[PDB]
Design a protein around this ligand. Structure first.
Ligand SMILES: O=c1c(-c2ccc(O)cc2)coc2cc(O)cc(O)c12
Ligand SMILES: O=c1c(-c2ccc(O)cc2)coc2cc(O)cc(O)c12
Lengths: 230, 230
């Protein structure tokens, strides 16, 4: 029970943060974004396994959550990396793209603008480091409704409730009024729907891409998940 | 300021609820769903105009919110209508479909299952009538980030904050602990991302449909919005 205690949970999530990922480049923008995502997924899996209680979930729930959440978690990390730089998306060290470079690939400008506007909202709310760590973990745990709708099910609700309690604790430490605490929790959680919207649009765009101009991220992810079951 | 007061706001939303809509039927499932949506949009516009402060927003914000939110608001009303009936989707009086009827149209079963699982989550949480009225209005107001990221912008934040305060008031009246209040607010708002996910999948499916087997809902909606500007 103390591993899921707020201060301790926050500090555990801080140490599970993924490393810096480089594209390390030797049709090009899409190849770079998909190659980058495949490299980051490796570390996302590692991060998930470090969230207190995640590996105590059934294997079925662990895999369903990872397969559903990947673009959302990737995009939430992108938004945190780009928070202090209006008009820029810091995909990686590295791979810094300006909004206007989205004009070169059909369908991408729309996705860049949604990403930049969501990032702007988190900048305006002055998202804290401790709040970002809770939110990103909530994105993985709230990704698939199925796992919630028995032993493993009880557990997922409990785990999502503990991260939420941590977020509530972080907001209370800010010293603001009870009304303002309630409002800040609502403003942050309403933004989760905008991160989900971006991920859905990104996935739709990727699925509409011609196979030759892209790394097959999803199939590579499934191989990773099979590789981690065996 | 008292029009946006919690008890009064809830009671105003209750009276702005749309009427029952019938398909009134004289390739068929998709025609029925799209004909139904076009009829409901007429009343959705009317409902929006009755939410305190909505018509005080700039015309640009009113139209952007309506164009972005339509499938989400339609689907949240569907989920409320179907809440007490596992395995059934009560699209309208009527037009009651069983989960298995989704098997007949390609791509629809996936959307029916997401709708039925989200509906199941709201049933498990025992969503109250007063909570549903606040949530549906929050779905319209949180639909587009753009309008938030000056006079009309200030206003949208204020309006979204008032509905949120109403929801917080409703949850507090339930008598549960402060921790439980925080947790219930989080559980409901996290479900908004699942309603957004369903709407995105529904829109993608509709856009992939062959024009002859569907009513052109979106173009009809734009005509309604132009018809209401003029
Ligand atoms: O944003 C992305 C990303 C992406 C990559 C790394 C990140 O950290 C975040 C997103 C990957 O593939 C795409 C593929 C697409 O077709 C469209 C997209 O917007 C993306
Ligand atoms: O669910 C819907 C609805 C719909 C209709 C009425 C409602 O109250 C809610 C959703 C309309 O068009 C679609 C069109 C689609 O291609 C797929 C869908 O799932 C839908």
């Amino acid at each position: 029970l103390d591993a899921l205690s707020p201060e301790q949970l926050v500090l555990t999530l801080l140490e599970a943060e993924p490393p810096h990922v480089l594209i390390s480049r030797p049709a090009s923008m899409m190849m770079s974004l998909t190659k980058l995502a495949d490299k980051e997924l490796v570390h996302m899996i590692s991060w998930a396994k470090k969230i207190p209680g995640f590996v105590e979930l059934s294997l079925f729930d662990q895999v369903r959550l990872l397969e559903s959440c990947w673009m959302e978690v990737l995009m939430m990390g992108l938004m945190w990396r780009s928070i202090d730089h209006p008009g820029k998306l810091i995909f990686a060290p590295d791979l810094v793209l300006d909004r206007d470079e989205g004009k070169c690939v059909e369908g991408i400008l729309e996705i860049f603008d949604m990403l930049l506007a969501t990032t702007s909202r988190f900048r305006e709310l002055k998202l804290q480091h401790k709040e970002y760590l809770c939110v990103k973990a909530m994105i993985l745990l709230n990704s698939s409704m199925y796992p919630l709708v028995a032993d493993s099910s009880r557990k997922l609700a409990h785990l999502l409730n503990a991260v939420t309690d941590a977020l509530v604790w972080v907001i209370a430490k800010s010293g603001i009024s009870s009304q303002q605490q309630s409002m800040r929790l609502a403003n942050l959680l309403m933004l989760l729907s905008h991160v989900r919207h971006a991920s859905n649009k990104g996935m739709e765009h990727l699925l509409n891409m011609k196979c030759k101009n892209v790394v097959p991220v999803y199939d590579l992810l499934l191989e990773m998940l099979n590789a981690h079951v065996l």
